[PDB]
């Protein structure tokens, strides 16, 4: 029963630590089993109603989808419309809505 201070760590092997870390996920799976099955049902319904295949087609062929979109939308009209839209936000900042409030009220009568 002498005085000692050295400590010897236990051998938690590569697969041992892995099986503990996996059990961590497996526990939260059980803890949220309720929501897991609920989400799976919802997801099954999304495929059932073509929502999932619709997205799959969208990403699988998105290269075409985007090219189709940008080419049609690069008109002079669209460019001006979108620029003027941005311009509108800026000019609607210079406006003093304080004096527009009573201006509205007189039109009401």
């Amino acid at each position: 029963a002498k005085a000692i201070k050295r400590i010897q760590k236990i051998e938690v092997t590569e697969e041992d630590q892995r099986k503990r870390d996996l059990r961590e996920i497996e526990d939260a799976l059980i803890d949220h089993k309720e929501a897991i099955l609920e989400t799976l049902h919802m997801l099954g319904h999304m495929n059932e109603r073509g929502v999932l295949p619709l997205l799959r087609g969208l990403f699988g062929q998105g290269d075409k989808v985007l090219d189709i979109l940008v080419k049609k939308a690069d008109t002079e009209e669209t460019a001006n419309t979108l620029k003027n839209l941005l311009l509108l936000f800026g000019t609607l900042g210079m406006l003093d809505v304080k004096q527009l409030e009573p201006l509205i009220l007189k039109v009401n009568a």
Partner: protein, 975 residues
Amino acid sequence: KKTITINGVEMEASEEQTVLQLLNNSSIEVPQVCYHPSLGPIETCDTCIVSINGELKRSCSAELKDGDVIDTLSPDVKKAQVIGMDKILYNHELYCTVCDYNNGGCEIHNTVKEMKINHQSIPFDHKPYHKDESHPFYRYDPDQCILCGRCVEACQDVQVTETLTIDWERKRPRVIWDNDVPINESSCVSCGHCSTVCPCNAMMEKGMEGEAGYLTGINNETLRPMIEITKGVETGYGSILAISDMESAMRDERIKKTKTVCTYCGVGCSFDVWTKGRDILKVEPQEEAPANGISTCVKGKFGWDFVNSEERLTKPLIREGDHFREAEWEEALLLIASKFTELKEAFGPDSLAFITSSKCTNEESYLMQKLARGVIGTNNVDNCSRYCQSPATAGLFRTVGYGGDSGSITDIAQADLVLIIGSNTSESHPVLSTRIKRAHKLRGQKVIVADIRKHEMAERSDLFVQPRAGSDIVWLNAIAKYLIENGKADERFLRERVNGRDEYVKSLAPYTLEYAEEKTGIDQETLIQMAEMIGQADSVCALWAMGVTQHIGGSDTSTAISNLLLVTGNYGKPGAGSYPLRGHNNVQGASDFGSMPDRLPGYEKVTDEQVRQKYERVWGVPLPKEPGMTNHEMIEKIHSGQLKAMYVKGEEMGLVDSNINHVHAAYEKLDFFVVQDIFLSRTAEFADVVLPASPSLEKEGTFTNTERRIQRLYQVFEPLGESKPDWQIIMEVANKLGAGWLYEHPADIMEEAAKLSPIYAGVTYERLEGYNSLQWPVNADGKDSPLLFTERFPFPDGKAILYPVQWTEPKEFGEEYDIHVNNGRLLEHFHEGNLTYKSKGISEKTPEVFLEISPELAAERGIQDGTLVRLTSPFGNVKVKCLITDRVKGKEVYLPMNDSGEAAINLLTGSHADKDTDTPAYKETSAKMEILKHDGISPLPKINHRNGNPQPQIGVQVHKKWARKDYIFPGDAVK
């Protein structure tokens, strides 16, 4: 008395002094930012303006006259409260959305919401001062300071440290420390009151900064523009405040608040612990706390970083030659069971010693004694109360009847006179002193101090005497002699509730006034003025500690204190009694549950045949008849080949028992050693099987504090790794031998003990829910006793027995050992530092152990500061560093026990002990002076709670604010 009219409604008063107190009880909405109930009115926010009899005045400070007409809804009163709030928001940026103080309790945030205010007329302005992060525990944001002075009122009148002040003479008045000195360099005691009493984030604990919310993590470099963009866009406070309330509500998901009882001193401070996962954000004291309210010391509010230390033990250890190898729980539980039974059936049950801790709960102590008595079959059960509370218990058992305080801490603050005998109360039971100092400051309470060191309590006192070592009993008897001869003593009490007057009178014969002057060293002039004030006062509270306990005649001096109060009628009176300050968090609680080897739980001796059967009926094992051995005497039993094994839980007795040179040799002399500590301590090095315990926050249970207050714990976090709680370990250890105990949670252990214990007859976990607590003796139905011996004493006749005690000559070393070496506690360091030095901020104010020398002593010995000195004793030798200090006197140095090593005052302490209950005499040690160095790193730096200079004052000096010509009262602004 007093009939009033609240907005036309007729009313009547019960006892309220102020209008605000009435409006609060009557559930009427009224803003009151600077009013804190524990602090009293300050008149710094001006948000409580009401029309009483037509006059616009602050309701927080408004005497409740008869026939007053309170108006809390007039357009003029509301308009005035508004003006006040605009001057509050002038010194508040308000960013609740990204502020850590947005948790549904920010008095500013909740008041803006209450006041229906959406546009402040006075915009915010940055204060020209910097944030002070110097202190490792709390910060000061001047830009968020609203000069409410709640912190100032707390530091001066509540904590009574007097560091916090407000410079009103400045252009922008701000909260200053001393003479506007940075907090680390100032006289800051680090209690944490200022942060508890601040209503907003101006005074905030650094553990919450960027941790409380979800958006709080954002760096200030990006969060500051985020705020500026928000202010520019926002319309009214109503909308953005509602969004902030949603983040505040989402905060409940991640933040947990758990009620706990402090594991530091025996004050019994209850408080909530705001934790997010494993990290602690803040210790949030709640107003309804029984022993402290919103009061804390440094340790209780900030000393919890030890729970998250690397030195923490997670997996049990087993000895394997030159090392400790990590081992599985079941394979370790089998090993201890194998040796225990092997030794039991070879040498006897008496060959197994069982040491409990004064840190462990009531249940833990009860089960440790149940394992030793009802499983092993021996009565060898003891805690650290042999050297700590043995004279504190024995002294009272021999005279009044119960081994505990005569009342609660509240009775100390109400008392007319407070007598303090040998107690560094400021740096041992701090929250207790913030009641004594508070009453001395506000109520003019008579305070008498009696010990060899001039500590904080001594300097803030009305009278201070310095008796010699082991001579307190002499002056105690002399005062009693003077009081009884001059007819000053309460004779009605002596006839009514006292048994044995004339016998005790005859024992005071050699204690003449002149005799005391020769022995103690107290001039008869002051000696007679302290005796005259003891008898002059209506109620006297006698507070003694180690300066009485750790002596050759420790129990004699304790008995002398109690019958001195008995002689002047200071029992069963609200505001008087004997108060032996219990040092440990659960030193009273452990003692109550049969941890004494002389008694079973409920203080019933192991000698009653009837009580031995009462416990046997419910345990099923014949309770041992052979009386056990005390913690102190079982050390000798090892050297004599009588003790084979020992089970010490959570106690460092191989560092705190008299002469550690002998107890170290005694440790390596036994066959089996099972230690149950949370860390690998000095005691744990000599162990064969180590069991990793779970600390205070990682378990639930009960703690009976100094005022015999049984409080309940709530599990803050679940055991770290595989560190089972102490009670669980004891159950598993008993089961591995053959006990079959079944307790689903610690509450089940209590109901088994509560039935058997007569004083704890009616103690239930439901009665201790939340901040509820009971004070034993508590009846079977649930009737507790805050004050002891109100109608009768615990003796057959109902009277108290006086104990004649003669001044036993204190055994002094002498010849070559002239410079006496004292021992005691620090404010921040709870012993060696196996919990406090782990909190790295506590290690900045106090980094190492020191030897306090006086300027008179450092002249005759030719020594300076930061020098190595060698104090040699006939029991050991220390390598301490000399600290020049203005507290000690003559040739009497002070060695505080804050180092578990070579500079420990337990090496020098002698084997000699008290002549009644085996109490090691630590305050009876002398040594010789040697020098090793002339210059080095000073043991105590400038950045300490003692080096700074306080600026005392009462209140916040609100008239200084009112003197400024910029200040205009909201009420007369409308006029």
